[PDB]
Amino acid sequence: GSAPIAKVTGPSTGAVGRNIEFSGKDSKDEDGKIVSYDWDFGDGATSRGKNSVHAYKKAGTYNVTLKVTDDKGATATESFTIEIKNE
């Protein structure tokens, strides 16, 4: 179709205060190039980029959302749930 499809790659679990790496690299678009990746880590922090990093300050479950936008302004979103624990 003409819409990009967003995919979030990351770890299902992680540690308080450690950098967690996420990626949007599996996102695809058959009708354009993906030009931007916008991240919301679910604790109020945001970032951008094909890859992103965040350290959570408190243990808990968090919903991470990625929005991809392509070269014709078309967008797609996807979510990823991570459990962060005290190690």
Author numbering: 685 to 771
From the study:
Clostridium histolyticum collagenases ColG and ColH are segmental enzymes that are thought to be activated by Ca2+-triggered domain reorientation to cause extensive tissue destruction. The collagenases consist of a collagenase module (s1), a variable number of polycystic kidney disease-like (PKD-like) domains (s2a and s2b in ColH and s2 in ColG) and a variable number of collagen-binding domains (s3 in ColH and s3a and s3b in ColG). The X-ray crystal structures of Ca2+-bound holo s2a (space group C2), Ca2+-free apo s2a (space group P61), Ca2+-bound holo s2b (space group P21) and two new forms of N-terminally truncated wild-type apo s2 (space groups P21 and P212121) are reported for the first time.
Despite being solved in two crystal forms, the crystal structures of forms I and II of apo s2 from ColG are similar. Each structure begins at residue 685, although the first two residues (Gly-Ser) are remnants from GST-tag cleavage. In apo s2, intermolecular antiparallel β-sheet interactions involving β-strand A could suppress dynamics of the region. Conversely, the PKD-like domain of collagenases consisting of multiple CBDs, such as s2, appears to have no surface aromatic residues. In this context, the spring-like dynamics of s2 may allow it to swell the fibril.
